[PDB]
Design a protein around this ligand. Structure first.
Ligand SMILES: CC1(C)CC[C@H](Nc2ncc(C(F)(F)F)c(-c3c[nH]c4c(P(C)(C)=O)c(C#N)ccc34)n2)CN1
Lengths: 291, 274, 65
């Protein structure tokens, strides 16, 4: 097209991603070149249909789409970094203000997104792209879906909420909220909070670390279709897990890891929590660490 | 959401004079390319006829295709032929590509083989049609301008019924309106209205048309429940918008069978040359 | 440099939409399907469905091209 292909940024299941320049502007873009009698791949049509209806600073902008026949290339702005790389950077310190800023943008993007009746369903640190002005964008809307009208397989396992793991068809923002919870835990612990190798082992580590739920905690848990009773764990007190976390952040984390996804704080409720309004400012995007 | 949609922004036109213009343009622009012939009213008669064809396709689709797919398909077919001639892209084919894209965008997961299993042909025809559908799927999408989410009136319609059941016991059972307001949404769908007014306005006009058709004047719903006593010009802007829709369903005449047969023969001919 | 929650002030060009938590209080949830126990345990409520239906009814009702 009008695009120069600079760099292979990576490849995963549905697309190869290239850093590319339009022969039209100074602005670098990220072209996601989507791979194959189905017609144009649904994960591309998913990003096209959603990102054309979302206009928020904390959601990735679709710039263009082009292609030929059943192949397509979605063009997005290039994001220099992502939250996974920030979390994994061993020589980069996550001050509480950095953590608050990342969380704030994530929740603002999510609030907008949930207001527009969409779930990302694939929040994890690598899908939280940072532009070079330090605006975190939600990105990789390839699993994102409209709610308030699904499937349990969604969200990469370490961020997958227990209601997803118990086979919940229907869900709402709590799948994103638990994933925010997990991303928050990993901004704190600097490693996967619940790195479980299977649906069974993810539920085990959930119940090991946070305590096994009850019907006092999660009213109709037992009605989830892939439910099985775990042994009662005590859980590890959230101040023994997150010993740097203040009571406000633990109150956040607590509400982000509430077993009842109904009780689990929404992006709006989370944003109204005292954590965000308290004395350490959420860092300006300009001053977030570039890894 | 509609109020910040690409539909509102780009696909709800200021009047039918702007519609007629985009169409009359594209007929001329076809001729300018083709010389480097149906008249615009004849393209319109055919697009009316093939939007009927799209509706029949979507209505018999063997995995039960949702109204929000069918409405999205029909909307893609209205938007396509605003800016493209039926003499460049054969409406028969583009209708399938409309349904196809709409199945995918509305998340109605149906594989290509059982998509074309619905076509009333031989399997060679089904394969050839599938191949044409896949030939035009990106074309369609480029001509829809990558504005793929279509706000149908049907969810707005559910919300007004919830709102009426809750807040307007003047209309004791609102659900009695459902049939004739659906029939009126179906009639509004054949018109230009989808390109001219909002999904909520269409939904409310359909409700108030069914209300009026039952003799139940719901003026107090508009003034009192919707709070347009506060702003009576917004009440009259609303009433004007709804008046004009009832006039669109009034002025709409179906394409005649005997007429469409001539225009079809012309269309086939425009496609067999060139 | 503190944050303060300010809602999104997206203009809907439509009637006032009754807040999600008020829908039961205001009696709108009498007119939508109750979310079943599996729905509820997944975090899906009758209020989500209701709220979106009402949001869509009202959105762009007053808007002129
Ligand atoms: C290594 C870093 C941190 C610095 C470059 C990269 N910059 C960037 N800018 C924009 C986009 C967007 F969002 F615009 F595409 C994307 C992108 C999004 N999905 C991707 C994938 P996948 C295949 C997981 O979808 C892979 C893989 N592998 C690679 C890149 C992307 N990346 C992000 N990673």
């Amino acid at each position: 097209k009008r695009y120069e292909k600079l760099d292979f940024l990576g490849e995963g299941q549905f697309a190869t991603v290239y850093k590319a320049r339009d022969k039209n502007t100074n602005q670098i873009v990220a072209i996601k070149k989507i791979k194959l009698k189905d017609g144009i791949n649904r994960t591309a049509l998913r990003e096209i249909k959603l990102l054309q209806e979302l206009s928020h600073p904390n959601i990735i902008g679709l710039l263009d789409a082009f292609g030929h026949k059943s192949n397509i290339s979605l063009v997005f702005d290039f994001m220099e970094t992502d939250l996974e790389v920030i979390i994994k950077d061993n020589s980069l310190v996550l001050t509480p203000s950095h953590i608050k800023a990342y969380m704030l943008m994530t929740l603002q993007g999510l609030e907008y997104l949930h207001q527009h009746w969409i779930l990302h369903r694939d929040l994890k640190p690598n899908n939280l792209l940072l532009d070079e002005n330090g605006v975190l964008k939600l990105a990789d809307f390839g699993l994102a879906k409209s709610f308030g009208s699904y499937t349990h397989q969604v969200v990469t396992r370490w961020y997958r909420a227990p209601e997803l793991l118990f086979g919940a068809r229907m869900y709402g923002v709590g799948v994103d909220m638990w994933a925010v919870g997990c991303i928050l835990a990993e901004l704190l612990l600097r490693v996967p909070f619940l790195p479980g190798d299977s649906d069974l082992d993810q539920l085990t580590r959930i119940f090991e670390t946070l305590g096994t739920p009850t019907e006092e905690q999660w009213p109709d848990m037992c009605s989830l279709p892939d439910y099985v009773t775990f042994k009662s764990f005590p859980g590890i007190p959230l101040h023994h897990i997150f010993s740097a976390a203040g009571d406000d952040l633990l109150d956040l984390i607590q509400g982000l890891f509430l077993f009842n996804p109904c009780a689990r704080i929404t992006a709006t409720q989370a944003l109204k929590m005292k954590y965000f309004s308290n004395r350490p400012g959420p860092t300006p995007g300009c001053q977030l660490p570039r890894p | 959401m509609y109020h910040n949609s690409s539909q509102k922004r780009h696909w709800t036109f200021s009047s039918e004079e702007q519609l007629a213009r985009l169409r009359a343009d594209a007929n001329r622009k076809f001729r300018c390319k083709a010389v480097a012939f149906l008249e615009p009213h004849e393209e319109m008669t055919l697009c009316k006829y093939y939007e009927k064809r799209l509706l029949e396709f979507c209505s018999v689709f063997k995995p039960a295709m949702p109204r929000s797919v069918v409405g999205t398909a029909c909307m893609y077919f209205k938007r396509f032929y605003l800016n493209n001639s039926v003499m460049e892209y054969h409406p028969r084919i583009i209708m399938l590509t409309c349904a196809f894209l709409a199945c995918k965008v509305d998340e109605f997961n149906v594989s290509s083989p059982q998509f074309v299993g619905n076509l009333r042909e031989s399997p060679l025809g089904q394969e050839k049609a599938l191949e044409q559908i896949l030939e035009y799927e990106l074309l369609l999408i480029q001509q829809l301008n990558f504005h793929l989410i279509v706000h149908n009136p049907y969810r707005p319609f559910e919300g007004f019924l919830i709102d009426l059941k809750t807040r307007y016991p003047i209309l004791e059972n609102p659900e009695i309106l459902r049939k004739t307001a659906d029939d009126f949404l179906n009639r509004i769908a054949l018109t230009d209205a989808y390109l001219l007014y909002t999904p909520s306005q269409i939904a409310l006009t359909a409700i108030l048309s069914s209300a009026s058709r039952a003799g139940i004047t719901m003026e107090s719903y508009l003034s009192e429940s919707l709070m347009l006593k506060e702003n009576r010009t917004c009440l009259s802007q609303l009433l004007d918008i709804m008046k004009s829709m009832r006039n669109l369903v009034k002025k709409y005449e179906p394409p005649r069978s005997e007429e469409v047969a001539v225009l079809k023969q012309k269309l086939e001919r425009c496609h067999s040359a060139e | 440099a503190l944050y303060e929650y300010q809602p999104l002030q997206i203009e809907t060009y439509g009637p006032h939409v009754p807040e999600l938590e008020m829908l039961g209080r205001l009696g709108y949830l009498n007119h939508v399907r109750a979310a079943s126990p599996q729905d509820l345990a997944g975090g899906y409520t009758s209020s989500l469905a209701c709220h979106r239906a009402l949001q869509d009814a009202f959105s762009g009702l007053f808007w002129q091209p």
